[PDB]
Design a protein around this nucleic acid. Structure first.
Ligand SMILES: [Mg+2]
Ligand SMILES: [Mg+2]
Lengths: 104, 189, 143, 145, 144, 55, 75, 68, 171
RNA sequence: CCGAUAACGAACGAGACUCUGGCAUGCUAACUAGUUACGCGACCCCCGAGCGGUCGGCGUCCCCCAACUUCUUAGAGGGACAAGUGGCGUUCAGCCACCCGAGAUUGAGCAAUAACAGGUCUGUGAUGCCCUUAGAUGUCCGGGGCUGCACGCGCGCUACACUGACUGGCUCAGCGUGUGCCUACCCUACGCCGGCAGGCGCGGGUAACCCGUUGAACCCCAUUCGUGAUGGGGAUCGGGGAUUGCAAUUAUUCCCCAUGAACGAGGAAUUCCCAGUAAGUGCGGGUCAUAAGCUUGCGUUGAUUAAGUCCCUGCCCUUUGUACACACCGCC
């Protein structure tokens, strides 16, 4: 077994996040594990504003850099065991995956 | 039926001259319960014409740095001023305000660029919208320097400014400046 | 027609609660109520003499509105604008000892009890007292 | 309460060695005494048990001498220790509020003590410059020219 | 008699201040955050709060239980959010559970009294730029 | 001299305790998000870290 | 326009001056009472609430920054 | 003011009109619905702007012999 | 938990690792036609792929040099042993890689070819490999002491907007 | 852009593009977001209501032991195009007004050829040449200095008060950060002591889980003050108490009590700005062992005026004159 697991996927780009969150759940449906819906957490916007010039001479122009971090949560819940059933991950570079259980 | 501030029905107020009856907005289509409405009246030209003049007075009464967002304070100032003028005169505060606007709007001014005769080269009559704008600005300014450094509060100062303007007594800064402008324009004719 | 505290204006309500707390005086009033300022950012002591009762009434009303508020939370409510003189103004918090002593006097009157977790809330009979005073002030305002 | 002016209403008083305006409120009239401010005046009136909503000119002799006594000797009337000006005096280490030109001569003796020991703060006081580390480059010009 | 499941939940916005009115069949009452409508902190805007009620009449409000929750913005933004939310909740209730005849001959009064009672104000803010204190003003410049 | 005075001056804090992780500079560091990189070096490498410009 | 040296407490000359025509004109505010009786203004507020207690002046506004009074109706 | 169309939309509109004059119509939505399969438009804004110009040019065509 | 750092710092550290590894590979494999580095990180292990033109040159005698670099990247960042694998991949259409062409131009200039002929050759090779356009700018102490800049551009070249990011490769 | 047309065919820039804000009761999804309903409760009314009212009290993803996504979040999609109507127009390119509409001009980012002896060699293990290199211009350690003051200037903060100050009560945000490779230094709930600054124990949080429902300020409601250099202003200055550090004097910062100085709206001059804008107002980040009058962002309140012109300062195109070409700061 009686297990209930949580898989969180985080990266910088929505295209790869969406395709992972799609193919994983489609594999789950084809492998008849009932799926708790994908929860899209609020985006983390890392902002850094820095003076453009390396000198301090100029018109005081500031360059602003952003890093968008998006994360999704999918809860895999089955009456039987889960980890022995699902072993493949099919994870491309860029996206980071973390799997916990209900105890953690 | 609308009863601005809960009283002072609008339907009895009459504008005495047709020059400003398309720019004063006290009639029942523009009668509002309270002079506060985020109506986007500055989005397009001539949109302030259909803005109620009590709203205009509230917006122009909040000036000089300390008071640029204190619209609730300005609304309470206008309410107290209407109470005071009603007690002092007995007629409609809206009627007093309309008469003050009419008597404060300067019918002509002077404007040019080149070698000035007295103030400007040419004497030019003004638009009704400019009449209303100048009248409201003059009334608020007169109330402000009336209330600046004396014990008499801003409510009474605005009240007696409108009272003096609605009749014409040379005791109000609005019509004093109006007469000065008229004399300058007449000299610049 | 039952009356709760949310159906009456909180200003004269807290005034009436302070008056009741004054007339039925069983508080643990500290010895420094005549000297201390109510906050770091204030520059004079409160004008009213029995300000402690008004403050305790306000704390009871706030605890009714939301429970589990500790001393730091109450200082967050009673914080204000510190003018800082020539420097630009900022925000300051209330007096921690004042809030603590008000709360301790409240559980001395046993209308406030600590939670299972941190902070303290109102007891059922404290809620009863608040509602009764709300009803009587509603009646006074009506007729 | 809102009566006529009382018969024994002196317009200014004589407290210690300075006069105070009796036209203003009592809580702010004795603030004209050097060494007394809004907080000190309020606390001494509170512990003197005098109505704060009355002017200083309408007080009586017993009330004013009670104020005198409490101002002169705050320690024995439950004025807390941390509230006084000359706390932990450099000469005798005794906690005392100072109320009059005693404050002026105490400032004088402390400044001349600093000058005598030739400390940097005392030398700055002698030269008329800032003593709290402020920048003297761009400000303080009026005091010199 | 005892017809259940008669409720709508309609929101209104004014400067990121959202207000959700839960209109429901019952006796006529309107409450905001558990407090009476006529009793709010900026009582100057009590007329703005009561404006839909004064326009439409207590009879159309006599059959509705409305509870409004606000969790954003400032004070007057809250007030405008509540009035818009109440108006939109009433027109949604009249559009769903009774005829659009009544819906239209209340919506017209609402519109040609105040368009903002039923249409949200899109203007929110504007980002500050790195040349001045605000969105458009610039820091004072000097030449000598 | 010996070990007792060569590096004895404390640098557990302050600007001298921090240096750029790239160029060992001690001015214009960015410690936000544990970056520990110079102001100029961050502009140099922001494409590589992933900080890209949007507005 | 130099100074006002306004009275802080009433006297015999101004007490009856207050009592016999202040509840006779249309506008009674502490500011106008102060400026036409040459008194301070806290005195004006206190006198006006005393006359409220006596009941010969009708309050209309009662606002924290602008309080307005009037005389009683005739007829 | 500032609603002048550019070559990118004008040339594309003329080309698709001369190619699919039978399928096109005077309805803006119908034209913007034929555009996605008669042409590859990288942007929705570009697609609908081209569709609007197609409506204008077809009104002009049905009222007279436009150079297209 | 307490042992793992937050997501913000973790992503920033990943970017720092990518940048440091890329700078190291640029300064080390410069003469071997270095083009780029791609890291595929998994909790089990990580794979570093070096896109370079001369794979047989970046791989030393029986992989001695790739083993050396694998050990270096092992020791510098302190991975668990046997948890990182380094592969070398030959790029496709090396004329389209601005990094490789800039490195080749630098190699030619260091060899001593005339800058005019070398830049013409680089441009011709890029357009022969097939691109919508190319632009090479050489700045510095050309000819005399006074510095000059020569720009050789042909074909199409956009400069503004978003599509420059994924259409123009700049080195 | 339409059009003419010794040009035809192109290329860059502009536009297109990306992000952002506004509408989606349409779709997907939510115990790290909630709503509705129901059940335990706690309180008021109990005259009698009782499917009465309040609850940020406890529960119903504790797994069978409710549903749903309106509110919040974030993805895929839609939506706006001068599309429709009237007028003007060579009846073209387009412009004006209006209807319906969330929106009929949301703000940014990117940004051409050619240049400047514009700024940085004090960002770099970017760097040529020159200088120094053991009594060092390397490097380390101690102390001082970068703050130093007859004076002038620039960016700012605080004010000159009653549209206010004080005192108390009531009541509302959104950006965004938070425990470290070196590297020691995180955000803090709650309880207790102290008047305050602070201190002492218990926890939570590597985070839509905790701070935090970010109880912010302004504002609102009552009190005192009363036209005075006054309860405006808080500079200067004395004494005392804590905090950081290895160290606080030339005061790091903070707290308390005293002193209330100029300042009563500012000459000649001059800056910025067109709608959620200016301005008032606070709150985050950077700097940070200690810390913001700075800067970069965020939210709250919210206007006056204008929909024009080339008059001043400039910019673009065409014609024109030139003795200028380092180009009118020219030449003579
Ligand atoms: Mg562009
Ligand atoms: Mg004071």
């Amino acid at each position: 077994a009686i297990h209930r697991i949580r898989i969180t996927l985080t990266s910088r780009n929505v295209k790869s996040l969406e395709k992972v969150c799609a193919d994983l759940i489609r594999g789950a449906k084809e492998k008849n594990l009932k799926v708790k819906g994908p929860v899209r957490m609020p985006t983390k916007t890392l902002r850094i504003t820095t003076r453009k010039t390396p000198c301090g001479e100029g018109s005081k122009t500031w360059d602003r850099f952003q890093m968008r971090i998006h994360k999704r949560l999918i809860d895999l819940h089955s009456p039987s065991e889960i980890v022995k059933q699902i072993t493949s991950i099919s994870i491309e570079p860029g996206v980071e995956v973390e799997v916990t259980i209900a105890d953690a | 039926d609308i009863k601005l501030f809960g009283k002072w029905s609008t339907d009895d107020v009459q504008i005495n001259d047709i020059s400003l009856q398309d720019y004063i907005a006290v009639k029942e289509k523009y009668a509002k319960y309270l002079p506060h409405s985020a109506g986007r009246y500055a989005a397009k030209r001539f949109r302030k014409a259909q803005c109620p003049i009590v709203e205009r007075l509230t917006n122009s009464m909040m000036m000089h740095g300390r008071n640029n967002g204190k619209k609730l304070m300005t609304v309470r100032i206008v309410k107290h001023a209407f109470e005071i003028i009603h007690l002092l005169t007995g007629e409609n505060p809206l009627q007093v305000l309309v008469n003050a606007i009419i008597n404060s709007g300067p019918r002509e001014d002077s404007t040019r660029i080149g070698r000035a005769g007295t103030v400007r080269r040419q004497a030019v009559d003004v638009s009704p919208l400019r009449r209303v704008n100048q009248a409201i600005w003059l009334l608020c300014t007169g109330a402000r320097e009336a209330a600046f450094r004396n014990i008499k509060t801003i409510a009474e100062c605005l009240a007696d400014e409108l009272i003096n303007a609605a009749k014409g007594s040379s005791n109000s800064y609005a019509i004093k400046k109006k007469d000065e402008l008229e004399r300058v324009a007449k000299s610049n004719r | 027609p039952g009356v709760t505290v949310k159906d009456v204006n909180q200003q004269e309500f807290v005034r009436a609660l302070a008056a009741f707390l004054k007339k039925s005086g069983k508080l643990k009033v500290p010895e420094w109520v005549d000297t201390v300022k109510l906050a770091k950012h204030k520059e004079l002591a409160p004008y009213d003499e029995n300000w402690f009762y008004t403050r305790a009434a306000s704390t009871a009303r706030h605890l009714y509105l939301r429970g589990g508020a500790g001393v730091g939370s109450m200082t967050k409510i009673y914080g204000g604008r510190q003018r800082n003189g020539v420097m630009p103004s900022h925000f300051s918090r209330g007096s921690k000892s004042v809030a603590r002593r008000v709360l301790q006097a409240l559980e001395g009157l046993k209308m406030v009890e600590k939670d299972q977790d941190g902070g303290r809330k109102l007891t059922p009979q404290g809620q009863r007292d608040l509602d009764r005073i709300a009803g009587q002030v509603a009646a006074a305002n009506k007729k | 309460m809102s009566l006529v002016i009382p018969e024994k209403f002196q317009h200014i008083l004589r407290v210690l060695n300075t006069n105070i305006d009796g036209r203003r409120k009592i809580a702010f009239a004795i603030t004209a005494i050097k060494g007394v401010g809004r907080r000190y005046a309020h606390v001494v009136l509170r512990k003197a048990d005098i109505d704060l909503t009355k002017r200083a000119g309408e007080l009586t002799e017993d009330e004013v001498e009670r104020v005198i006594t409490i101002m002169q000797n705050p320690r024995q009337y439950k004025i807390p220790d941390w509230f006084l000006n000359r706390q932990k005096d450099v000469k005798d280490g005794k906690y005392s509020q100072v109320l009059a030109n005693g404050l002026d001569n105490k400032l004088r003796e402390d400044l001349e003590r600093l000058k005598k020991i030739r400390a940097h703060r005392g030398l700055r006081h002698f030269w008329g410059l800032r003593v709290r580390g402020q920048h003297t480059k761009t400000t303080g010009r009026r005091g010199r020219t | 008699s005892k017809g259940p499941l008669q409720s709508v939940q309609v929101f209104g916005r004014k400067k990121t201040a959202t207000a959700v009115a839960h209109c429901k069949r019952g006796n006529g009452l309107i409450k905001v955050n558990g407090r009476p409508l006529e009793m709010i902190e900026p009582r100057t805007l009590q007329y703005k709060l009561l404006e839909p009620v004064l326009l439409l009449g207590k009879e159309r409000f006599a059959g509705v239980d409305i509870r409004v929750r606000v969790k954003g913005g400032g004070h007057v933004a809250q007030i405008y959010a509540i009035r818009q939310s109440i108006s939109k909740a009433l027109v949604a209730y009249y559009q769903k559970y009774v005829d659009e005849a009544s819906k239209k001959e209340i919506k017209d009064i609402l519109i040609q009294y105040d368009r903002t009672l039923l249409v949200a104000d899109p203007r929110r803010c504007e980002s500050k730029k790195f040349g001045g204190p605000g969105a458009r003003a610039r820091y004072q410049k000097s030449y000598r | 001299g010996h070990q007792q005075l060569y590096w004895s001056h404390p640098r557990k804090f302050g600007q001298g305790s921090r240096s750029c992780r790239v160029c060992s500079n001690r001015h214009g560091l960015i410690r936000k998000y544990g970056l520990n990189m110079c102001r100029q070096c961050f502009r140099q490498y922001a494409k590589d870290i992933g900080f890209i410009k949007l507005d | 326009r130099d100074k006002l040296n306004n009275l802080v407490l009433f006297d015999k000359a101004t007490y009856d001056k207050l009592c016999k025509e202040v509840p006779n004109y249309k506008l009674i505010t502490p500011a106008v009472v102060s400026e036409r009786l040459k008194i301070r203004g806290s005195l004006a507020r206190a006198a006006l609430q005393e006359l409220l207690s006596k009941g010969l002046i009708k309050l209309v506004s009662k606002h924290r920054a602008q309080v307005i009074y009037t005389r009683n109706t005739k007829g | 003011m500032g609603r002048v169309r550019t070559k990118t939309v004008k040339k594309a509109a003329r080309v698709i009109i001369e190619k699919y004059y039978t399928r096109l119509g005077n309805d803006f939505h119908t034209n913007k619905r034929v555009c996605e399969e008669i042409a590859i438009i990288p942007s929705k804004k570009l697609r609908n702007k081209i569709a609007g110009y197609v409506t204008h040019l077809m009104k002009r065509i049905q009222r007279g012999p436009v150079r297209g | 938990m307490a042992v793992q750092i937050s997501k913000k710092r973790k992503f920033v550290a990943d970017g720092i690792f990518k940048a440091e590894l890329n700078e190291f590979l640029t300064r080390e494999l410069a003469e071997d036609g270095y083009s780029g580095v791609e890291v595929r990180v998994t909790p089990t292990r990580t794979e570093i792929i070096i896109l370079a033109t001369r794979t047989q040159n970046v791989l030393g005698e029986k992989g001695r040099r790739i083993r050396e670099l694998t050990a270096v990247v092992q020791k510098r960042f302190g991975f668990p042993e046997g948890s990182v694998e380094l592969y070398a991949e030959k790029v496709a259409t090396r004329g389209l890689c601005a990094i490789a062409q800039a490195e080749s131009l630098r190699y030619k200039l260091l060899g001593g070819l005339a800058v005019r002929r070398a830049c013409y050759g680089v441009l011709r090779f890029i357009m022969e490999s097939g691109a919508k356009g190319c632009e090479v700018v050489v700045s510095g102490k050309l000819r005399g002491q006074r510095a000059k800049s020569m720009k050789f551009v042909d074909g199409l070249m956009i400069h503004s907007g978003d599509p420059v990011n994924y259409y123009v490769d700049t080195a």
